[PDB]
Design a protein around this ligand. Sequence first.
Ligand code: GSP
Length: 304
Amino acid sequence: ATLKVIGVGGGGNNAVNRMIDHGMNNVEFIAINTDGQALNLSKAESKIQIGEKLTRGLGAGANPEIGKKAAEESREQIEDAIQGADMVFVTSGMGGGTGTGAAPVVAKIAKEMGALTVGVVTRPFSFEGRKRQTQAAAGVEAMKAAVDTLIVIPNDRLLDIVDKSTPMMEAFKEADNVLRQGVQGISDLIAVSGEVNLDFADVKTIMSNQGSALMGIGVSSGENRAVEAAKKAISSPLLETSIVGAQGVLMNITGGESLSLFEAQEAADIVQDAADEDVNMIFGTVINPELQDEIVVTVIATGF
Ligand SMILES: Nc1nc2c(ncn2[C@@H]2O[C@H](COP(=O)(O)OP(=O)(O)OP(O)(O)=S)[C@@H](O)[C@H]2O)c(=O)[nH]1
């Protein structure tokens, strides 16, 4: 199953560049922008410049109608770059001109083409003002009605989880953790055949046309290693929705040879309780003898 990560706008490409510098293998990146000046500094193995005649190589100057029309008009090259993909993550800063307008349509392209399409967008800092927060909003709703399932990140939460000293690029990286977690997690299920296996059909089942989504990976060792990992796993302070009310869950548990039944049940109960609802849970496990004292819980939860 081939996974493609698509940045749309400068935000999206920064997202991409950081994720490359982090090193993610067996995921194919695509950078997409109106701004040529940007794309020239992207590390993406594949780049697509859109709205060329609309903007002559400049960004969309905070009118999304431009990013929209731009992409809608470079559809065919986009499609060629997409093709061969089973799942696509569409990543974008909402509020700009390019992202807000083009991103909803990259994903609508991606959905019609048949891909399982996950939106991962940022809402902007309150300090960017009301007007941007509203353009951002319009984007997010287009993105919701355009994808299978959407992840939203109000940028303001960074200010809540950062200390007064943290460089800006660090805060943005911490926001990247969401995308990195989903991508690494799914990539990992797909690549490994478990004792109780999860595969891509399960991903399709919990993620197709489900609205809001949470994606986590939690890692821990110690006494309560399984409760602690499942608790790390299901908890971003960076999201718009919590886990509560979830209606679909896919959950994988990876451990060494001492992975107990009792504690697999314990992590699964962390989750099942946490939704506060009768869930459709699909459950899987992997015993990786390399792993010594630590376990990793991968959780993907939708249905809000
Ligand atoms: N969290 C995070 N947010 C970003 C980043 N880059 C931009 N943003 C936010 O996302 C929004 C849009 O990002 P940006 O890439 O500048 O828009 P654009 O679509 O490129 O807009 P334009 O070039 O046509 S004007 C901005 O309002 C900003 O708040 C980033 O690297 N990390």
